[PDB]
Amino acid sequence: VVLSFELLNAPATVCGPKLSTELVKNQCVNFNFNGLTGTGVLTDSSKR
Amino acid sequence: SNNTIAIPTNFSISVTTEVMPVSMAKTSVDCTMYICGDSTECSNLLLQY
Numbered sequence: 001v002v003l004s005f006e007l008l009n010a011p012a013t014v015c016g017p018k019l020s021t022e023l024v025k026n027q028c029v030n031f032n033f034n035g036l037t038g039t040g041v042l043t044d045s046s047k048r
Numbered sequence: 049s050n051n052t053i054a055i056p057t058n059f060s061i062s063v064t065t066e067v068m069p070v071s072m073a074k075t076s077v078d079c080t081m082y083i084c085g086d087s088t089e090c091s092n093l094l095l096q097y
């Protein structure tokens with residue numbers, strides 16, 4: 001079997017088994033959203 | 049002509065504007081933040097430079 005992936009800016013359709021944690025806003029944290037992972041401060045936003 | 053001269057009979061006071069740059073914007077770069085962002089892993093590789 002050949003699995004061909006695409007990792008677009010589009011809704012996640014298949015995911016790995018990671019357990020999910022609560023949001024931690026206004027602190028510098030490691031984060032991972034749908035595998036997009038980085039470090040920074042999370043806040044609400046006005047963005048459309 | 050070898051025997052005539054022009055002499056100014058009058059004058060003008062002139063004011064002229066000369067514009068000169070003297071400074072530029074002082075700039076500062078956080079070389080770690082520019083290269084690595086906040087990622088710890090890249091900052092460890094950057095130490096090897």
Ligand SMILES: *[C@@H]1O[C@H](CO)[C@@H](O[C@@H]2O[C@H](CO)[C@@H](O)[C@H](O)[C@H]2NC(C)=O)[C@H](O)[C@H]1NC(C)=O
Nearest residue numbers: 053054055056057058059060061062063064065
């Ligand atoms: C240089 O020229 C100016 C005019 O371009 C002379 O000023 C005039 O002088 C006459 C007579 O004194 C006046 O009627 C005018 O109103 C003046 N005009 C201005 C704009 O000032 C000036 O007298 C001359 N300079 C010399 C040394 O002769």
